[PDB]
Amino acid sequence: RPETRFLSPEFIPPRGRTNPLKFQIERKDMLERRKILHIPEFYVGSILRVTTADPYASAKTSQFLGICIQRSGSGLGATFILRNTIEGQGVEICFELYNPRIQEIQVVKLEKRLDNSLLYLRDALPEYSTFDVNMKPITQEFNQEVPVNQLKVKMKPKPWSKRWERPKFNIKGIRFDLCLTEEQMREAQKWSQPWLEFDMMREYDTSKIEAAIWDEIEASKNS
């Protein structure tokens, strides 16, 4: 069974000219944090349950379950969004990974979906935003390589929170043949910026950095 290293996306530093030291510091601290709280591997579309410390509840713990809509951040600040419908009310929460108020993160389902971010579940029929609050964790063999769920989605009628048809978004996850006219699809294509893919210089390189910080992580396990 071949193992390709999975790197939690927040160890990847941003592209700016920020001094590389700052990131070393931040990483030491979040690796320190990882020793207490165990942060699992997961991707957008995977379903998580998060336990929080809440002062105002009866049991000081607060559970929330939902699909991961997006991950963004870097360093200590990195966040993820969980989406779930309750009683017909769509609800999202935005959790900071490294916040000490977080007790435990539990992956109920490890999954990829066709898009790096799906915010469009806001505009989809409510089923894709709904999950059983009590649903039990499901386990996998690694060699299945984080199975990519291929599911196109049904939409409410336009307008939508954003225009998902536009090329800047790159969404394969929506079912567009049911939603739109061929004319609206030619229309969306006037915003296409083909040259961007071939721009070379626009592309960000990592691999040297990733080698470095992976080295750093191993050096954090050893001690």
């Binding site: 910026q193 071939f198 210089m201």
Partner: protein, 153 residues
């Protein structure tokens, strides 16, 4: 406010800029030495350096091929990139390009001009600036210091 903007605006817009650099690149890969507006040559130099690193990725890599497809316009050149340029850069990581300022254009628009080049080409060599020789008085005074950094160690 221009803060941390790496690319300069050229041509009729962003796309026109890409096509400008397209032609310049094609020209560079064909003739191996060209001269143009100092700003445009400066802009190009990045792409001309990365193209060679897509050439190093080999004929068989698909990404490198449709990359060289888009950027090299006369399709005849795409082999030359892979089977001539990319091989003759092997040892060197980044050293592919030489860019020098030429005297301002003799036309009435009096532009700022640069020559840009792929190293190791077969052409009369540019009259590069030479450093001073070591026999020069000041350098000879430094050689003394050096030989006394050796003698005292």
């Amino acid at each position: 406010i221009s803060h941390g903007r790496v690319f300069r605006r050229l041509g009729l817009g962003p796309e026109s800029r890409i096509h400008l650099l397209q032609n310049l690149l094609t020209g560079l890969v064909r003739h191996e030495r060209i001269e143009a507006s100092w700003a445009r040559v400066d802009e190009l130099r990045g792409y001309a350096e990365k193209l060679i690193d897509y050439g190093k990725l080999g004929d068989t890599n698909e990404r490198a091929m449709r990359m060289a497809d888009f950027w090299l316009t006369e399709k005849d050149l795409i082999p030359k990139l892979f089977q001539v340029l990319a091989p003759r850069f092997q040892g060197q990581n980044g050293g592919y390009t030489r860019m020098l300022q030429i005297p301002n254009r003799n036309e009435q628009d009096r532009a700022k001009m640069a020559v840009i080049e792929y190293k190791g080409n077969c052409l009369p060599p540019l009259p590069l600036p030479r450093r001073d020789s070591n026999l020069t008085l000041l350098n000879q005074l430094l050689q003394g210091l050096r030989q006394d950094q050796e003698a005292s160690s």
